[PDB]
Amino acid sequence: AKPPTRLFRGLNLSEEFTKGLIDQANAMIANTTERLFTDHSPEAFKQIKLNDLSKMSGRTNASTTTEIKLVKETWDSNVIFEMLDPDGLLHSKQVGRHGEGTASAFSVYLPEDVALVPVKVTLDGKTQKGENRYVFTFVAVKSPDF
């Protein structure tokens, strides 16, 4: 199928929530993701699923795009989730354009045994409201199997 291996999704999130989201991601990046990446930790996997930073957990048809500019220039999201899926662990179905005012997209399902593991939070410019725009980069990883 050769699904796309990088997808983006944006949300408009409040200032206060976004600040807490940054802090939570960076706490996991330094402190939880390491256990998953180095020691293939089941507990660390579970904590990442439960935290669900991206709000993707359980969604079977969340809309995404391969083009980050489409997110920025359609919804002017202040928070953009960049999902790296080299193993095609997501179920990514192309939803083509169908008529006026539409755009191509990928509809995604995040299985319970796939975690979007946070790896970075990066400042990426400003929204049209003058908000700082943040990109949260994740890698999709399979539950460890011992």
Ligand X SMILES: NC(=O)c1cccnc1
List of residues contacting ligand X (CB under 6 A): 8-10, 63-65, 71, 75, 105
Measured from the CB atom, the residue of 31 and 122 that comes closer to ligand X is 122
Nearest approach in angstroms of CB 64 to ligand X is 5
**Cβ atoms of 140 and 116 closer than 8 Å:** yes
Describe the chain by its helix, strand, coil percentages, rounded to 5: 30, 35, 35
Nearest approach in angstroms of CB 73 to ligand X is 11
**Cβ atoms of 35 and 27 closer than 8 Å:** no
Nearest approach in angstroms of CB 79 to ligand X is 10
Taking each helix axis as running N to C, give the angle between helix 15-31 and helix 42-51, from 0 to 180 degrees, rounded to the nearest 10: 170
Measured from the CB atom, the residue of 10 and 118 that comes closer to ligand X is 10
Nearest residue relative to ligand X (C-beta): 63
**Cβ atoms of 119 and 137 closer than 8 Å:** yes
Measured from the CB atom, the residue of 31 and 102 that comes closer to ligand X is 102
